[PDB]
Design a protein around this ligand. Sequence first.
Ligand SMILES: [Mn+2]
Ligand SMILES: [Mn+2]
Ligand SMILES: [Mn+2]
Ligand SMILES: [Mn+2]
Ligand SMILES: [N+]
Ligand SMILES: [N+]
Ligand SMILES: [Zn+2]
Ligand SMILES: [Zn+2]
Lengths: 180, 180, 368, 368
Amino acid sequence: DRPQKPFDKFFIDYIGPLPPSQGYLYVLVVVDGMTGFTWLYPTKAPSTSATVKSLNVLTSIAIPKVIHSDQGAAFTSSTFAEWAKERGIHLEFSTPYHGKVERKNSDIKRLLTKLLVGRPTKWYDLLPVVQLALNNTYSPVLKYTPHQLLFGIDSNTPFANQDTLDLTREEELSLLQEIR
Amino acid sequence: DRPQKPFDKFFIDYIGPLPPSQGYLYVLVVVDGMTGFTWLYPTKAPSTSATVKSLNVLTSIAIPKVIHSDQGAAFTSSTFAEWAKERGIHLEFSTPYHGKVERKNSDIKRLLTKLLVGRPTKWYDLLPVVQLALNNTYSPVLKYTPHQLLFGIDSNTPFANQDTLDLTREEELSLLQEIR
Amino acid sequence: LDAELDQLLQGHYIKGYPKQYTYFLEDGKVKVSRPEGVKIIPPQSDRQKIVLQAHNLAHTGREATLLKIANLYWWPNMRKDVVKQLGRCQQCLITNASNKASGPILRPDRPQKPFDKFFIDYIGPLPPSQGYLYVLVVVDGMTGFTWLYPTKAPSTSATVKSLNVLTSIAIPKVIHSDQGAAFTSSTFAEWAKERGIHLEFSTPYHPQSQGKVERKNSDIKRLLTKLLVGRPTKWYDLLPVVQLALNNTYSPVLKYTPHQLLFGIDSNTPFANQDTLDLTREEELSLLQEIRTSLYHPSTPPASSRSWSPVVGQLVQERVARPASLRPRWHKPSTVLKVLNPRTVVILDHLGNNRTVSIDNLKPTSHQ
Amino acid sequence: LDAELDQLLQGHYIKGYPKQYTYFLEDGKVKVSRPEGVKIIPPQSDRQKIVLQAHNLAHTGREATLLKIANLYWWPNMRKDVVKQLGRCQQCLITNASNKASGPILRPDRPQKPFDKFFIDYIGPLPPSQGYLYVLVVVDGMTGFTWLYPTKAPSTSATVKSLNVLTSIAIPKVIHSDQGAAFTSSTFAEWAKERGIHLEFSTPYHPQSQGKVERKNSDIKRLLTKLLVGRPTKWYDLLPVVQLALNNTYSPVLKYTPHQLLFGIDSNTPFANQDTLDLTREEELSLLQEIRTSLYHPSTPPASSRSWSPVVGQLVQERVARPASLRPRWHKPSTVLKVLNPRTVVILDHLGNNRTVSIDNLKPTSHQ
DNA sequence: ATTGTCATGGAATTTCGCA
DNA sequence: TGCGAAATTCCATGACA
DNA sequence: ATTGTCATGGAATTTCGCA
DNA sequence: TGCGAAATTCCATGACA
Ligand SMILES: [Mn+2]
Ligand SMILES: [Mn+2]
Ligand SMILES: [Mn+2]
Ligand SMILES: [Mn+2]
Ligand SMILES: [N+]
Ligand SMILES: [N+]
Ligand SMILES: [Zn+2]
Ligand SMILES: [Zn+2]
């Protein structure tokens, strides 16, 4: 079997609804399977068309062989089916209700919360740094960060402090204050 | 003594008043002494300033060493004096009331009359052809026309018919009809 | 189709496919083991669509197209099919640039006599001076002797007004100009016919063709500039000064001023040359005829290493004159009817009109 | 004055005036019998005013000035006085053209890594598409990999919006641009400092300096053109197509697409190269590092036969940027402070400011 | 049915002034 | 039949469009 | 404080396929 | 160890400003 390469598989999924930030409510998460490289797109809905609009930007840079998703409404529509067929992208679905990728999805949910607290509205602007972080974070499995695996080079923004990622006491209580 | 060249002397004088033609009443006549080449300028007056305006055009092409004129008002003013001194042109006056040149002055007066008759107003437009005629007319003295003497070449408009120049019976009576 | 590929699979030899390689079937397609790797040999019936899809990605030329195809396929004489396509892509043919230079410029003979040929042209618009915005420049071909007339517009009527004043001195055989509205109008044509003046025209959008006058415009503007330094740009009153200044200026290569070429003697202007003081006028005119014939004449320069000259029946394309934003810079291909000279042709513009055209406004359609 | 001319009249020898000729008085002036004719020798105290009057007629250069003077005068070493004047005529110095070419172009080293250097620039205005009129073009120095963003204006704010989206992928060391309003504003400066991005700027009015991106603009426009043939110019929806098309197009000289230089593997696009199928990613990245170092690099071309290179302390003049009609095309002379490289200098613009300037926007002031 | 041109100022080459 | 410097000529460069 | 670039398609040169 | 043709490389030309 041929070894795994970048662009072999993109894993997509939505996160949200979030607090409104500059008119946006969700995040479309795209993680490359081989490299663990993450792309994020703000959307107003988890709809086929918010997906197609966003993937259109990404698929202007790189086209995956396969997209993998849950059986979310957005991804099982025949519009989205058409959209992929048009690009020779093959669709792949995890069965309803059922590695490297799943950790990344967890990291994103957690790293977001760590910063939305105190400013649940400013997340739009933070999406760029959130990504650089995610993509310049060392993998303990592979010796390399996804940036290095993607481009074959060190980055000019190394995140030398693999960070707390953890909610402190000031936050735990002001995140339990926001919820009330 | 050095032989006579073109630009050695320009002979100027006014002709008119004429019938109004496109707002103009006189002709300033400039005849080069050596060549017999004629330049004509329509003016509204025989004034220093109509003269200076006209000679300014001509003296943009060629500057004479000497201008010769009668003691006309236009030419004896100190303005006109100044104007010439400015250009290193020397002024020269025939004494009050007193060759090749004088014949030309006669030709012009006559050739004009030959064509102003029937149309005493259209002379402005005719000034160009009047000149070509005058300047492509053979001298019996010299073998050459003033065009040839000026440029050292044949012209593309030879006036092969040295013409009547003379007033016929139809004209004599319609010029005596205009005068009444 | 499967025709040629079948005998190939068995191992019997077909022309074009080198026998020393091994051709097989796998996954449903005919393949081959080439040094760079394993490539699909498509059936000839498929090859066109392939070249097409490859070229169409970014509308690429020969190599950049070839390199895409060579990623998956191999077949005999690939570039031949690539080039066949390129020569048929309307969109590349009318949008790409040429990479072949015009042949070397002609240097036409100097008119033999003053008034044999006038070059005329307009300069402007310029900063308004006394309500005037243009300058009509008339340049006698042989002498360089130049007349200037301030105008309000580059109109036929302002042209006629000025030239009636000028022609009062002499009438020229020919007047050459560009295809400007002011000169191509029938009013001007009739003014010319009325005087036995032949109107000559520069091929379209090729100012080199009025080079004489374009070049003189440069001096006119350059001297106006110098004269107006630190002053406001009142150029109307300076035209007469510039006319005189220029007509009486030496051309270092000829060692004569245009004035001297015109008259054979300087007039009463500063630094007037006195060398023919003692000759009679006739001796002067005789020496002037000799000066006029022996003037320096440039020779046609060496062709650049990759130029083209036009050949009758060649497929060529005229340059789009004022091409809109994001539209092709070239017209569809057309055919060379007649070679008027190595730098001028008559083309049938496949509408089709006859057009006389400079090779500077032409490229030779690529790929035959 | 009469000083030197007196001893000359008597017949005793003075340095400069050849003894074999005969010098005399006539009409009040000192004259001399020269082969071309008889010429007035003015007193040295008069010679400057003469050269001046001659040059001032049409503001002529060396020979054309000399020839006027030689009509009446002769004195020793005339051109030396002529040239002294020319070098002092403010009006000729700032209006005349240069007749010396720039020295040969530098070919800077290719950035070593992706994101070492971005070249950025705006294209437009273009026909409005969906209310957009410009395109922001970002071109990675090393790979040629290019991003496109449709904008409404070439504004700082639209630049920042687009680059925040782009830098979400990586942050570059350097961003190079021209001195456009959008890039020189302090808002942009702070956006850069905020990210440890160094802003690099092209010397003024010298787009060769952003050559990388200017050149890529050409392809962008050329492919947009081809794609819009016979259609109305709706280019907004095509930017994404053009981005992809171009990033995945082979450079015939490199034999690599910018995409491959960026990632070392083609993505799921047509005609994807498969040669590294069997290597592990790491084997791939290792071969990519080697591909990146051994790319073709052009060499500086031969100097043209009459070029100039800048020398510290040389008198030079900067080109006027947007010169008004009939105004000088050059600034007053200024002095070369420092030669940054054979094609770039720092001049004291005699106001005086320090300016860093390309030699293409410079001429060496004439006559020392 | 038409077609490049020429001021410019350093350099290269020729000529001059003198033996 | 030759040297140093001056005068002249050469000519690439750029700008008119 | 900075610096030209590269698709293009005929031609020139090298390599291949075969003895 | 050499031939004809094909493949590749060279590179001048022009267009981005
Ligand atoms: Mn989901
Ligand atoms: Mn009188
Ligand atoms: Mn013009
Ligand atoms: Mn630009
Ligand atoms: N000719
Ligand atoms: N460099
Ligand atoms: Zn095409
Ligand atoms: Zn001057």
